[PDB]
Write a protein that binds this ligand. Structure first.
Ligand SMILES: OC[C@H]1O[C@H](O)[C@@H](O)[C@@H](O)[C@@H]1O
Ligand SMILES: OC[C@H]1O[C@H](O)[C@@H](O)[C@@H](O)[C@@H]1O
Lengths: 121, 121
């Protein structure tokens, strides 16, 4: 039963807990770095860090994956892009016309899985 | 429509994009710090940073709020606790038997509001 609730008032500027993304990747994903927090191992190469602007969110996302995450790319509502980073194995799946709220997952020395929470438009 | 999708396999240790929380607070909340990213102003006192364990999430949460956020406390599924931090004003609202996925909000010099995304069990 996924849902959300607002608390408090109407002032201020909006912000998101999903502030920046980087990855370590080779032929698959070694790690995802979320808001500077490292999730995964130390292999592969480190990508640049994508920092979302105010009012910017992931609107499209392509993940190549098998038993492990092989490739990530995304696009934002402002027309900016991240990736593709990773390899060409696994199967591709796309989220289209979304707003990504959160990225959880599972990682060891490599990135096993991602759980993407989002609104579908 | 709020939903989620899983990509990848079953290995590794679970993690969350929402990996640590701290606040600045006096009589109300000046800021919330999510994964080290500062959201709000410089007033009040800095709380310690709660860092979630793998597979640990907010299961219960009490927020005191009015037109601004007044107080935050939460408990995790592992029995650990954060807060209460803040003042005693506003009205209290509780999320019970949940799994918090994301904390967004709105802030200027203080914490105006929070948008809490969560699973309701
Ligand atoms: O991504 C998995 C693996 O792919 C490549 O072989 C290299 O870049 C490694 O360092 C990396 O760990
Ligand atoms: O909480 C709002 C306000 O409360 C108190 O008066 C002080 O601790 C301030 O520094 C703080 O900004």
């Amino acid at each position: 039963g996924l849902t959300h609730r607002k608390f408090g008032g109407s002032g201020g500027s909006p912000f998101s807990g999903l502030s920046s993304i980087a990855v370590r990747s080779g032929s698959w994903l070694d790690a995802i770095i979320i808001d500077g927090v490292h999730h995964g191992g130390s292999g592969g190469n480190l990508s640049p860090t994508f920092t979302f602007g105010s009012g910017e969110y992931i609107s499209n996302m392509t993940i190549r994956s098998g038993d492990y995450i092989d490739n990530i790319s995304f696009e934002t509502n402002m027309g900016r892009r991240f990736g593709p980073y990773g390899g060409s194995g696994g199967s591709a799946n796309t989220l289209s016309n979304v707003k990504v709220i959160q990225i959880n997952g599972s990682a060891g020395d490599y990135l096993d899985s991602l759980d993407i929470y989002y609104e579908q438009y």
